[PDB]
Amino acid sequence: RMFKITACVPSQSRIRTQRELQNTYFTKLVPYDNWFREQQRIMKMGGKIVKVQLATGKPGTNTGL
Amino acid sequence: MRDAVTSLIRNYDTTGRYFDRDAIESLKDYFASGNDRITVAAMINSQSAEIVKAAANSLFEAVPELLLAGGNAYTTRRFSACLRDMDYYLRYGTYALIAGDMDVLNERVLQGLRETYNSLGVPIAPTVRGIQFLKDAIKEMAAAAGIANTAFIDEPFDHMTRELSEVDL
Amino acid sequence: SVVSQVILRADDELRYPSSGELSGIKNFLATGAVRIRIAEALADNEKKIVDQAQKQLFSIHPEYRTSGGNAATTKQYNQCLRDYGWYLRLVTYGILAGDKDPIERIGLIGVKEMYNALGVPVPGMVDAIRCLKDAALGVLDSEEARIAAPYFDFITQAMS
Amino acid sequence: SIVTKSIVNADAEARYLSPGELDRIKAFVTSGESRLRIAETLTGSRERIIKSAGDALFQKRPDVVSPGGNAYGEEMTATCLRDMDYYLRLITYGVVAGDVTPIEEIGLVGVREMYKSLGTPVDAVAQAVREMKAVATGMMSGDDAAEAGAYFDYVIGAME
Amino acid sequence: SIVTKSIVNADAEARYLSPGELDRIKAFVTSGESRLRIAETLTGSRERIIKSAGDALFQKRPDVVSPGGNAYGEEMTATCLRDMDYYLRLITYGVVAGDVTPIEEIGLVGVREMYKSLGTPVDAVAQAVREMKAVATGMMSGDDAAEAGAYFDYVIGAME
Amino acid sequence: SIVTKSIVNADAEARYLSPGELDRIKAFVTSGESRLRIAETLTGSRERIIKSAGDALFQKRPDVVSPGGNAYGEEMTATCLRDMDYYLRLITYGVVAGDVTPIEEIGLVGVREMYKSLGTPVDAVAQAVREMKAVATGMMSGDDAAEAGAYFDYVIGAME
Amino acid sequence: SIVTKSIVNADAEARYLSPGELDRIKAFVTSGESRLRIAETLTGSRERIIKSAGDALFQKRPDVVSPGGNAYGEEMTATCLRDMDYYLRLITYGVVAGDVTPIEEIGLVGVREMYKSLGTPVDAVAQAVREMKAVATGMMSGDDAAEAGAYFDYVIGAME
Amino acid sequence: LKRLAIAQAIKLSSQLIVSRAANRIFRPISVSRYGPRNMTKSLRDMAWFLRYTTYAIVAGDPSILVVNTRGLKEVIENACSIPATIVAIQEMKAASLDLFRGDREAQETVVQYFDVLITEMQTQVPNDKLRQRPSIDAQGL
Amino acid sequence: MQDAITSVINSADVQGKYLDGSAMDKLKAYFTTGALRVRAASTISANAAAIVKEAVAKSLLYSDVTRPGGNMYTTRRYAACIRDLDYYLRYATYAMLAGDPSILDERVLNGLKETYNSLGVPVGSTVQAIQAMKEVTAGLVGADAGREMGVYFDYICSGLS
Amino acid sequence: MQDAITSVINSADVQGKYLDGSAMDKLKAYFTTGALRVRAASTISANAAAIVKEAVAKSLLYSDVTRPGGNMYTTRRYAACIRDLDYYLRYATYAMLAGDPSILDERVLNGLKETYNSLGVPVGSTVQAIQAMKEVTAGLVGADAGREMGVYFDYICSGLS
Amino acid sequence: MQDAITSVINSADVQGKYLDGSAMDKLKAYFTTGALRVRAASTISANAAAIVKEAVAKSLLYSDVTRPGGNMYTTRRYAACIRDLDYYLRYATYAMLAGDPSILDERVLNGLKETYNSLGVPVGSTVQAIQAMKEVTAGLVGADAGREMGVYFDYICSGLS
Ligand SMILES: *[C@H](C)[C@H]1/C(=C/c2[nH]c(/C=C3N=C(/C=C4\NC(=O)C(CC)=C4C)C(C)=C\3CCC(=O)O)c(CCC(=O)O)c2C)NC(=O)[C@@H]1C
Ligand SMILES: CCC1=C(C)/C(=C/C2=NC(=C\c3[nH]c(/C=C4\NC(=O)[C@H](C)[C@H]4CC)c(C)c3CCC(=O)O)/C(CCC(=O)O)=C2C)NC1=O
Ligand SMILES: CCC1=C(C)/C(=C/C2=NC(=C\c3[nH]c(/C=C4\NC(=O)[C@H](C)[C@H]4CC)c(C)c3CCC(=O)O)/C(CCC(=O)O)=C2C)NC1=O
Ligand SMILES: CCC1=C(C)/C(=C/C2=NC(=C\c3[nH]c(/C=C4\NC(=O)[C@H](C)[C@H]4CC)c(C)c3CCC(=O)O)/C(CCC(=O)O)=C2C)NC1=O
Ligand SMILES: CCC1=C(C)/C(=C/C2=NC(=C\c3[nH]c(/C=C4\NC(=O)[C@H](C)[C@H]4CC)c(C)c3CCC(=O)O)/C(CCC(=O)O)=C2C)NC1=O
Ligand SMILES: CCC1=C(C)/C(=C/C2=NC(=C\c3[nH]c(/C=C4\NC(=O)[C@H](C)[C@H]4CC)c(C)c3CCC(=O)O)/C(CCC(=O)O)=C2C)NC1=O
Ligand SMILES: CCC1=C(C)/C(=C/C2=NC(=C\c3[nH]c(/C=C4\NC(=O)[C@H](C)[C@H]4CC)c(C)c3CCC(=O)O)/C(CCC(=O)O)=C2C)NC1=O
Ligand SMILES: CCC1=C(C)/C(=C/C2=NC(=C\c3[nH]c(/C=C4\NC(=O)[C@H](C)[C@H]4CC)c(C)c3CCC(=O)O)/C(CCC(=O)O)=C2C)NC1=O
Ligand SMILES: CCC1=C(C)/C(=C/C2=NC(=C\c3[nH]c(/C=C4\NC(=O)[C@H](C)[C@H]4CC)c(C)c3CCC(=O)O)/C(CCC(=O)O)=C2C)NC1=O
């Protein structure tokens, strides 16, 4: 199962560390098992989550993921 | 990391005994001199970038080769690296001044400093003389500011240059 | 603030705030009223505080007023005064949160990038904040000066 | 402790101690006398605390001393009172240090794994620390009982 | 199942099914008839399995039915036998599927968190599945008892 | 082999062997006798397999033995039959082990890089293993030819 | 091209173009006239290059035109000369662009997979580009033949 | 070889370039109340700018100039007058173009590297990269 | 993420003004309620698992959602439900300590509706579970601390609905 | 991702019921067809590259798409086309072995239409290529194994269209 | 990412044709303008920070956006604004060197509008800042090099708006 999420994560640490730029506002397929820590981490960095959509899940099943 | 309190706690924990008379007296001895450490730390937090620069110029007046040709504080890249190193020494000296124990200096400064310095070609000797130029500057500045006792100021820089020290005796 | 730092650190390690952190929160929230009083006293007298600090800064450095400096024309000079006023406002903000958090978040993360994007040197700003420090310390008593002073010294630290 | 936690929290952030953290360390340094008084109160009367708390625990949870429970028999009840003595000692350490990093960093990290490997119900251990808290806060003044009950509260919270 | 596990294990490796995995699927396909016979044996006599296993469990662990335990009372004992019925149903699913991914993927992942939130001793649940295994392998032939006891063994192993 | 693959696949997953994997290992353990019979069939008649397969290959692909090809001359044709002997030996290893990890882990990983560095057409090597498969499955019974042709099939598939 | 490669190589490094890369682009900009002359030399005489190179290839490798080979028959030989025309066109593109990223990025990435799916010997294609290189460097002056033979060299090197 | 020719020309005549700088400098002309301690440092730095100009000219990249005289300004701003150093480096550029000539190709290389010097003497300082860490046990640097 | 102090400072800074008397009065209100906030946070940290399991025992147990077909059926779904309720109680404690619900819509209510709608999680049943959690913790910490917990619990239920 | 067995178990579990006679009959049907599925999977694993290259030789070769301007023109595009067809044959083999097309819409047909529409890949030409692949493999493995391959090939073509 | 040469080659390759006279004339035009492109790129690499700070001094300084409430208010926002303007000047230099704006919509204008709309960045003020940057660099490098810089600056402003 996978979530086709779309989020925008500003860093708020690039000014101190002076690193080069990664493009934010990504659209990615997250696996279901670690989508939790990923959503929590996007909330840790302070970024807004635009769209969460279950991609491959067929929701409501008990086995077969 | 350990302050003096967690040092006494780990000391009493490994035998499984409660605090006696003497443990309460040593904890009172840390808690009584706590305010003195905290005004010394605030007075250092006043002039940290000034004290680091003054200790650096006194060290370069002591050993004059490092500004000159073959020295290791040669270019401005090396000069700025040396002044940032002295800022590190003053920062963790302040941390050990507040903690009252040398475990922060052992875990975060002195463990494997000699490896980096011997590898990079950074000398260990004027590093130590600069650490105690910082110590002498801090000591006279805090003795000027009404503080009677300076043994706790004496503690961490003397430890840091007993550890980077080469034992030849 | 203090409670923001306690909440964010407890939010990292996925736990409730412990008893020592909450007791530090209590110790700040008990003496918040003295902080409210000293931020009142700093908001009152700010014109004369910025004024004497400006006078002592251009005692220490007449270089900026004179030809080739940043205080040459009175538009830039008015912004020198306005920078002083904004920094005193940020000092009262840093006092009232009980910590360095809003003053660093609003005015200290990247002062070097801004004042190199402009033309005024940062050691001049170090001397300027120290002038603001002894100016604002002449207007409060010691019971409040011990709370006022080290925020000025933290600005001095993050400048350099 | 408080000083360790402040030093580490400024240490990861690559900054010095903020002045709010510094008056936190200062307030803990001033309150150390009351902390040492609570520690002497908890240390000097440990016999009655452990005895009365074991009595009230086995009154409250009699199945762990009944045949079939963990603490059944002479030496098993002695080991049970020894575990309660360990936790009261860690309570005294956390009272002195001003934070729960002695208690957590010694006797609360793998407490579930250890007491699951021994076959011990952890809720009955939480009841043991609850009865220890009742006897201990029945032994002190009001603010002293609150300050000790904060650490007792942390131990029972870290059980479940 | 076996086919799901082989497909996924070849799927991560970016390869097709190896011939050894293919004769594994073939042998499971041939042994499906005996698997269905074990499933009918477990399905048709579920009443006596649940009844006798509950009787032997409450004989073995009487404290959970005594006042103070979890399964005390009429509806609590009915819910206890219902949980045993759930686990026997998952045993039948794992017998048919040829692997424990039905049992694990339905009723064994957060079993410790659930039974800790309910207040249930998990060792007594392991004893319940042990008595279910005793009654079930007392009901079949030798190789059938071994093949069913493999999945019963997995459930009791995943408890502790 | 099968046991290595099952152990590793349970090993990454931090779990024991599932019962379906265990009856997979059990079925491979029972079929090892037929695997050893196929291995003796392939081992004892290696001379005729290599000879007839080389004959049919050079009949099918005559350009590699014509002047200009790789296997032109006495010693080059001897090295060609030696490479075919190597691949028949790896076929015997994969027949015994029950999986293609001997064949892949010895003589199929960098086969394209090696035969490109030697200047060899890899399609003609696939034809060599095809003729070896024809002679070998012409030498056995039906299910034995299918079980050996699975590994021959894997070698020709791993060529292209 | 050269400008694309320099821009990308400075682009990953988060820096501007170094002055050495800038005089590289400048030297390529000045040598573009000779590059365009080599391109007109290769473009205007493509008929004789493709014809003579196909003649010398089928003289050198007659088995691919013999019955049994890939390019056997009228339309198959026409497709063979068309593939040679494609590669000469990519040679002209790489001559103009000053680098092999047109040649590689159009007709050299999956060339082994494509010619394996078609059933084509890739060594005979390398011989086709070798004969094209012989006819083309027989058609120019010395430094022009070296500069075109660099890209012909890259194509034959990327074949094997 | 042209870069070596202009580097050898600069090395062979560095003394008169530094002497021309000396009576250009000592934006008021400097008072020479500096004393010997500031004066020997000043003479060493007016050498040293030319040294890393010559190293940059031979090396082919001005990075050896950049990574040194970028943060140089606030090291020497408490010391001395910074526009005096600016017109000093500009004058040494004029002394290089005084010294040799070309058909506007080697002069262009020399004014390129000297322009990198005058650009980096105004970049006053960048703040250092802070490795702040999220872990407690880690240290920030 | 901002408490009452940081929001007051942000309002006075977006104004560009100094801290006037209304801001002083707001900060005095927070500095009077802070000790009650601290004691309620300690009491809630005491009984996290008890409040969560009493909320499930009040609302979700013995209903259809723990039966077959429900979204709380399996042990994985039960463990994830206990995890979600522990999250709601923990972040309600954080918003009670800060005195501002900015952490709730920053870090709970951000993509929670779309996550629950993609998974098939019933929003009404989890709103009833959060309401029972609020009722239990308001029985735990008293009237006014229960009210200042229930305002953020109602914030979570309003953003979820 | 679920085979016929896991889907039957999931239906009986979402019911909450035991395995009745209809589920037993469905599993008996799968356990009768499984040996044919195994042998067809081995025969398809034998001739992956041959089936792919015969599908291109039937449909895509000598048409406009391999000429200049076509989307199968360059060697990179040809290699990616062979890769895509190998994916379709491999996942059709997996769905044949499982007896359920859940892997196809989980792992092939998930974002395939939007990927092909963003790249400019012709969907009709690749549907004809998959149909020729189906025709070749149904000529390879026989009538009924070719039919049970073609049901998942038609599933891929229907989800692609 | 393609320059004028790679785009000409891509057009002639998508045709499948050889390089005819129009492609030769386009490449001759690029090979005549390339030395001017090189010298303008060196002159722009000379004065990156000066062009950026003169663009802020022309447009964004002493307006409302550097005052409280503006999006360029804090030092973090000022540093990020200088970073964004340095990005625009650097990529305009790259597109000037390539002679093709494909890098601009590949690597600047890709998600820039949605990023700026999510952050709250004013697009008109940054368009005016890029226009002042264009005016300053066209004063720096001359008429025609300033024009061939301003075509890509106008490309960035058009894709941003
Ligand atoms: C200055 C007075 C002396 C001096 C210093 C010098 N140091 C370096 C390089 C490094 N120094 C360190 C030091 C530390 N890292 C730590 O984490 C701590 C504890 C907090 C210390 C003390 C490290 C890691 C480096 C490597 C650079 C890096 O940080 O990545 C240099 C540069 C050496 C060079 O030539 O590159 C210099 C000049 N040298 C002296 O002469 C003085 C005695
Ligand atoms: C909220 C934190 C914060 C501050 C304070 C800030 C200041 C700031 N100071 C500026 C200019 C300036 N700042 C100064 C300040 C000084 N010159 C000196 O000699 C002294 C050392 C010093 C103070 C007395 C001067 C002279 C200018 C005008 C520079 C110019 O000519 O552009 C500008 C550009 C134009 C303007 O908006 O005024 C900003 C944005 N920006 C911020 O985000
Ligand atoms: C300082 C941190 C710390 C703790 C907590 C600790 C516990 C600890 N408890 C033990 C046993 C025990 N602890 C108990 C305690 C209890 N059983 C009950 O029913 C009661 C609820 C409860 C006490 C009130 C019992 C019964 C045993 C014996 C277990 C056995 O014999 O199997 C043992 C094994 C024997 C030993 O070496 O003492 C350890 C190590 N050790 C530590 O270093
Ligand atoms: C298919 C996987 C699966 C399992 C295992 C499951 C268990 C489960 N067991 C429950 C209760 C229970 N289960 C037990 C069972 C026991 N207590 C004992 O003492 C015995 C050792 C043991 C059984 C032999 C008891 C007593 C309760 C009631 C708990 C309570 O009322 O607080 C409940 C809450 C009420 C309900 O909705 O049924 C669930 C969801 N649900 C599932 O979907
Ligand atoms: C620009 C990059 C590029 C290349 C290289 C390319 C090759 C290419 N070569 C093909 C056929 C072919 N190419 C050859 C060529 C050869 N066989 C031989 O024996 C000779 C060694 C060799 C040529 C000298 C032959 C015989 C075929 C027909 C294959 C067949 O009919 O099965 C086809 C299939 C039919 C078509 O649409 O043209 C393609 C796509 N396409 C491209 O876009
Ligand atoms: C290769 C390029 C390069 C240069 C030039 C360089 C200079 C440099 N000049 C320094 C100091 C100094 N430089 C000067 C003087 C001057 N400075 C000038 O550029 C003027 C010519 C002159 C004043 C008119 C003085 C007086 C000091 C001592 C500053 C102090 O007391 O800290 C220092 C600090 C160490 C020292 O005392 O020498 C460095 C590293 N580093 C480099 O990497
Ligand atoms: C910190 C802010 C935050 C929250 C709240 C959060 C929730 C969240 N809850 C989830 C699942 C879940 N949440 C529930 C909860 C419920 N379903 C019910 O039937 C009940 C009504 C209700 C509980 C009271 C269940 C059952 C799942 C599992 C869904 C599944 O496994 O299919 C998931 C799916 C991924 C995973 O389980 O680990 C997320 C991301 N994530 C976050 O970052
Ligand atoms: C496992 C499930 C799965 C599939 C199927 C899949 C397909 C897929 N096919 C792609 C490209 C492609 N697919 C094709 C295929 C075709 N174009 C044609 O003209 C023909 C009609 C057809 C082949 C029969 C081509 C030519 C490309 C390359 C597009 C390009 O390079 O511009 C790409 C673009 C990225 C890349 O090549 O590596 C993806 C992701 N990805 C997946 O994860
Ligand atoms: C290389 C292509 C590329 C660009 C251009 C890019 C821009 C970009 N600009 C950003 C922020 C920003 N951009 C600006 C810029 C402006 N706001 C104003 O008021 C002015 C009108 C304007 C400057 C002229 C500001 C102030 C922020 C910070 C927003 C914030 O911190 O809240 C962010 C947010 C994350 C971060 O700061 O580090 C990104 C990703 N990223 C890229 O990958």
From Swiss-Prot, chain B:
Major location category of this protein: membrane
Compartments where found: Cellular thylakoid membrane
A Pfam family that the UniProt record links to this protein: Phycobilisome
Keyword list, A-Z: Antenna complex, Bile pigment, Chromophore, Electron transport, Membrane, Methylation, Photosynthesis, Phycobilisome, Thylakoid, Transport
PTM per Swiss-Prot/TrEMBL: Contains one covalently linked bilin chromophore. The chromophore is added by phycocyanobilin lyase CpcUS.
Signal peptide feature range: none
Biological processes annotated in GO: photosynthesis
Binding sites annotated in the UniProt record for (2R,3E)-phycocyanobilin: C82
GO cellular component, one term: plasma membrane-derived thylakoid membrane
Modified residues (N4-methylasparagine): N72
Membrane topology per record: Peripheral membrane protein
Family: Belongs to the phycobiliprotein family.
Oligomeric and partner information: Heterodimer of ApcE and this beta chain.
General function of this protein: A variant beta-allophycocyanin (AP) which forms a complex with ApcE, a phycobilisome terminal emitter that influences energy transfer to photosystem II.
Protein name as it appears in the record: Allophycocyanin subunit beta-18
Source lineage: Bacteria, Bacillati, Cyanobacteriota, Cyanophyceae, Oscillatoriophycideae
Underlying gene: apcF
From Swiss-Prot, chain C:
Gene Ontology cellular-component annotations: phycobilisome; plasma membrane-derived thylakoid membrane
Record's subcellular location: Cellular thylakoid membrane
Assigned keywords, A-Z: Antenna complex, Bile pigment, Chromophore, Electron transport, Membrane, Methylation, Photosynthesis, Phycobilisome, Thylakoid, Transport
Listed InterPro entries: Globin-like_sf, Phycobilisome_asu/bsu, Phycobilisome_asu/bsu_sf
UniProt record, GO biological process: photosynthesis
Topology of the protein relative to the lipid bilayer: Peripheral membrane protein
Keyword RNA-binding belongs to the record: no
Record's comment on post-translational modification: Contains one covalently linked bilin chromophore. The chromophore is added by phycocyanobilin lyase CpcUS.
Modification sites for N4-methylasparagine: N70
Binding site for (2R,3E)-phycocyanobilin: C80
Gene3D superfamilies hit by this protein: Phycocyanins
Domain of life according to the entry: Bacteria
Subunit structure: Heterodimer of an alpha-B and a beta chain forming AP-B.
Stated name of the protein: Allophycocyanin subunit alpha-B
Organism of origin: Picosynechococcus sp. (strain ATCC 27264 / PCC 7002 / PR-6) (Agmenellum quadruplicatum)
Curated annotation (Swiss-Prot), chain H:
TM regions (residue ranges): none
Leader sequence segment: none
Cell location: Cellular thylakoid membrane
Binding, (2R,3E)-phycocyanobilin: C80
Modification note: Contains one covalently linked bilin chromophore. This protein autochromophorylates.
Top-level lineage group: Bacteria
Record text on subunit structure and interactions: Heterodimer with ApcF (a variant beta-allophycocyanin). Phycobilisomes of this organism are composed of a two cylinder core, from which six rods radiate. The core is mainly composed of allophycocyanin alpha and beta chains and of minor components.
Family: Belongs to the phycobilisome linker protein family.
Function of the protein: This protein is postulated to act both as terminal energy acceptor (by its phycobilin-like domains) and as a linker polypeptide (by its repeats and arms) that stabilizes the phycobilisome core architecture. Has intrinsic bilin lyase activity.
Name of the featured protein: Phycobiliprotein ApcE
Naturally occurring in which organism (per UniProt): Picosynechococcus sp. (strain ATCC 27264 / PCC 7002 / PR-6) (Agmenellum quadruplicatum)
Lineage: Bacteria, Bacillati, Cyanobacteriota, Cyanophyceae, Oscillatoriophycideae
Originating gene: apcE
Curated annotation (Swiss-Prot), chains I, J, K:
InterPro entries named in the record: Allophycocyanin_b, Globin-like_sf, Phycobilisome_asu/bsu, Phycobilisome_asu/bsu_sf
Tagged with keyword Oxidoreductase: no
One Pfam family here: Phycobilisome
Predominant place of localization: membrane
Gene3D superfamilies documented for this protein: Phycocyanins
Processing after translation: Contains one covalently linked phycocyanobilin chromophore. The chromophore is added by the phycocyanobilin lyase CpcUS.
GO terms classed as biological process: photosynthesis
Alphabetical keyword list: Antenna complex, Bile pigment, Chromophore, Electron transport, Membrane, Methylation, Photosynthesis, Phycobilisome, Thylakoid, Transport
Record: residues binding (2R,3E)-phycocyanobilin: C81
Complexes and interactors: Heterodimer of an alpha and a beta chain.
Family of the protein in this entry: Belongs to the phycobiliprotein family.
Protein name listed in UniProt: Allophycocyanin beta subunit
Annotated source species: Picosynechococcus sp. (strain ATCC 27264 / PCC 7002 / PR-6) (Agmenellum quadruplicatum)
